[PDB]
Ligand binder design. Structure first.
Ligand SMILES: Nc1c([C@@H]2O[C@H](COP(=O)(O)O)[C@@H](O)[C@H]2O)n[nH]c1C(=O)O
Ligand SMILES: Nc1c([C@@H]2O[C@H](COP(=O)(O)O)[C@@H](O)[C@H]2O)n[nH]c1C(=O)O
Ligand code: NA
Ligand code: NA
Lengths: 325, 325
């Protein structure tokens, strides 16, 4: 037998609370989509040897380590995982957390265990700052996690904390039946030390900017999703993309390759709103005229301003498993 | 037969978005408690004449009008409602909405109808600004509604809007198993035109203040509730009570009678946090030392600084109905 697992990608709108005086830090607004997706089959390894196929080396080593640990934890068989459809690594799709939880849950099912995904996340050391991928793995839809309570020492040295349980979702909603335009831009994958050094230049952000981001997320995005108000939703997405303090810093860190696409989407009458997922290269867009947006993205792809584009829709469930032979 | 309905009071922490440039207006953070409570019995009026007992005149006239309308709407019998336990009127307990929805739903049950409470609210003209009482009637617990999308004209004349469907809850959580100390202060019930004139002096509030209130609510109160973090919860409640721009204006409008109690609660080591519900007179407090807080409130009541006090707990369900004879 095999356990077949499917999971959605995570698209992130913004991180919220990154100032040096707030009661809490982090917080992520995010949604789940069908494409790109993860599709993987977990079965007993014939030779009793853990085996991983169909991912980049970093994720494959990490899946092997996860399977060797869960094998010891649940006293299960050595597993092979064949990843038939991989989430693109370090592209703004939340691939590591989404894949570790999907495969872990699947191996869990193979072991006759039904794991808590927040616990599995903890066990595999995921969602230290973000609860987005962890929550969407469980629920799908649109979600905002409440990040982490800040300690009394926080105001003194905000840089030590900002950088064991993943934040639970303070908002979880079904995403309306609106199509999502995914835009794969030209974008570098960021340099670990270049990134840490970049983050320590931008953060802590002004307190007022944390507050405005909470306001745009909780009193902009989230009610628009809940009330299925397309115009309200797009107004909030654009306010985040084009005015969000931390988002602006992410766009500038990625540079012209992403900025040119966001400005093109804003300019285009076929694109009602557009966003950068994390630091990309994945951007995502909303349109009440997808026929027009298709034609717009096809020309950007021809010109070589983007590498690729596709329409997808929200996943309002999270991961799914089937037994197959 | 009779339908016996019980419903919790609504305690309000703060209104959120009351500036002249925000994507949305209003928004309420609130919770449901057992005491004060509503307890009412709805039966067929023997003489075929609508009858209301056990409330103040304003609410009684309004319940009669509601029963005469729902009678016509659902083609039901003339009802009598005996309100055995009334929510105190205009005291910060959300009595009108809570009572209209409880009695309407009960009469509904008498008519063999199961009404949508948001629709019933609309029908009876409730939750024009607040969704707090409407949502807590349905769910109980702790909730934050997302208020109302602001029109394009809003930025021009914010005063026209600020002042048909009630806002749905963007956050709904179970309240943890913490006791709530209710403090009934000396407080005037506000003058309709004194209030409208007061509101037009304070609102619109600065944009930065709207943003900080969203931040304290969504990235303060709500995650603390979700994670059952008492110290985090109290830190957020106090930040709202003592620094909330709009809350400060409500305290100053009510004056010394409420301000003296809030300052006493803040000063008291037995009171970890305290809040004013709307403009009161009801305040409410949290304590990890309720034995000490009991002794503190007993002395304030003896001295005559408060009229009354009681402990209660959260109601995590909303209204409940039973059939009785
Ligand atoms: N910069 C991040 C992250 C980081 O990605 C990593 C994976 O996250 P998940 O896939 O577990 O959700 C985390 O380390 C988080 O810091 N998330 N959202 C953002 C954002 O800017 O919106
Ligand atoms: N100033 C209000 C109101 C008003 O009370 C009335 C009843 O509300 P519900 O009982 O339907 O929730 C509404 O008209 C609202 O404007 N609510 N919360 C507040 C607050 O300051 O927190
Ligand atoms: Na556009
Ligand atoms: Na105190």
């Amino acid at each position: 037998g095999a356990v077949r697992v499917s999971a959605p990608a995570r698209l992130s709108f913004t991180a919220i609370s990154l100032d040096g005086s707030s009661l809490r830090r982090n917080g992520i607004a995010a949604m789940a989509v069908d494409r790109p997706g993860l599709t993987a089959e977990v079965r007993e390894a014939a030779d009793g040897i853990v085996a991983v196929t169909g991912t980049a080396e970093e994720t494959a080593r990490e899946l092997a380590a996860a399977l060797e640990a869960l094998r010891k934890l649940w006293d299960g068989p050595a597993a092979r995982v064949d990843v038939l459809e991989a989430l693109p690594q370090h592209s703004g799709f939340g691939s590591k957390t989404s894949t570790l939880l999907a495969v872990g849950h699947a191996y869990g099912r193979l072991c006759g265990v039904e794991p808590d995904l927040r616990e599995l996340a903890r066990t595999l050391g995921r969602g230290r700052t973000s609860g987005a991928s962890t929550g969407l793995s469980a629920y799908g839809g649109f979600l905002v996690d409440g990040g982490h309570v800040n300690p009394p020492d926080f105001a003194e040295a905000p840089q030590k904390y900002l950088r064991v349980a993943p934040p639970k979702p303070v908002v979880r909603l079904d995403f309306p039946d609106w199509p999502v335009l995914v835009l794969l831009t030209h974008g570098r994958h960021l340099g670990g030390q270049e990134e840490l050094e970049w983050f320590h230049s931008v953060a802590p952000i002004p307190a007022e900017e944390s507050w405005r981001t909470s306001h745009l997320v909780f009193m902009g995005l989230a009610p628009a999703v809940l009330e299925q108000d397309f115009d309200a939703f797009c107004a909030a997405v654009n306010e985040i993309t084009f005015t969000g303090h931390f988002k602006q810093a992410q766009i500038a860190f990625q540079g012209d390759a992403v900025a040119d696409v966001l400005e093109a989407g804003r300019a285009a009458p076929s694109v009602d709103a557009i966003a950068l997922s994390v630091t990309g290269p994945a951007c995502f867009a909303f349109t009440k005229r997808p026929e027009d947006a298709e034609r717009w993205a096809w020309e950007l792809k021809n010109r070589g301003l983007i590498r690729d584009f596709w329409f997808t829709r929200a996943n309002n469930q999270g991961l799914a498993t089937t037994v197959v032979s």
